[PDB]
């Protein structure tokens, strides 16, 4: 049934705006993602404790970004994507250079979510 | 004695040129300095284990830089200074934004060595 999914998005968007009022709409969702961060000093990947549902969102300023509602702690992840060149697809991961030059690695539990979300990110920044 | 410094200055410049041939002259010297580096992401200062005598040098191309002859290991530090704005003085320390965007902290044992060299940096 269709009406459920409009109601699912309505609850989802109300929650996202409760944490981040400037959010305007949900472009796409990924059921579960794990977050990694690359330490430029050790030059190795490290695992963060940020894990949960991934929401691709557009804010009032038309910027593209994603929120991850962490299932392990109240500390969520909200990062904008400013440029196509700053997001790559390598093997099973999304690697993202943030505005502050940090390097994030996204692993999606569903591989089909990885490929769909990465192409919708291309179509959103153009 | 003036003859004393003629051989001391001669040996110092002779040593610097052995590690860094482009070195042309020594502008000033600091007896002992410790080097710190700020870790991005970690948002902390780190101990660099580079410690020793500080040589402010002028380059073959007339560039300004400083060499620190490490007393703990053969790993020296040679960093150029591009602009007075790239070195600030904050609470007895010199903080230097290097060419590669790294930020180093210089600690001098003599504050008169500290501020004296910092005024020499503000020129050139």
């Amino acid at each position: 049934m269709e009406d459920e999914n409009i109601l699912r998005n309505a609850v989802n968007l109300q929650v996202l705006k409760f944490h981040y009022p400037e959010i305007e709409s949900i472009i796409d969702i990924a059921s579960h993602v794990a977050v990694y961060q690359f330490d430029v000093g050790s030059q190795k990947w490290l695992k963060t404790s940020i894990e949960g549902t991934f929401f691709l969102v557009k804010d009032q300023r038309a910027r593209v970004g994603y929120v991850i509602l962490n299932r392990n702690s109240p500390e969520n992840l909200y990062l904008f994507i400013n440029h196509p060149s700053n997001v790559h697809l390598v093997d099973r991961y999304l690697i993202h250079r943030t505005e502050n030059q940090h390097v994030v690695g996204l692993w999606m539990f569903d591989p089909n979510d990885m490929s769909r979300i990465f192409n919708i990110v291309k179509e959103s920044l153009l | 004695m003036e003859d004393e410094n003629i051989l001391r200055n001669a040996v110092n410049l002779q040593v610097l040129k052995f590690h860094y041939p482009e070195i042309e002259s020594i502008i000033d010297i600091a007896s002992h300095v410790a080097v710190y580096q700020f870790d991005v992401g970690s948002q902390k200062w780190l101990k660099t284990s580079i410690e020793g005598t500080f040589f402010l040098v002028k380059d073959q191309r007339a560039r300004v830089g400083y060499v620190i002859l490490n007393r703990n290991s053969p790993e020296n530090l040679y960093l150029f200074i591009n602009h007075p704005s790239n070195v600030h003085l904050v609470d007895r320390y010199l903080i230097h934004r290097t060419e590669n965007q790294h930020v180093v902290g210089l600690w001098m044992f003599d504050p008169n060595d500290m501020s004296r060299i910092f005024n020499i940096v503000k020129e050139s």
Binding site: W45, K47, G105 | -
Partner: peptide, 22 residues
Amino acid sequence: EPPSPSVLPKPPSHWVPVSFNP
């Protein structure tokens, strides 16, 4: 359940700054 950080691919060379000392 998520892979260990060890298997993650290396980032683009221009995304990682050079080491502190040449």
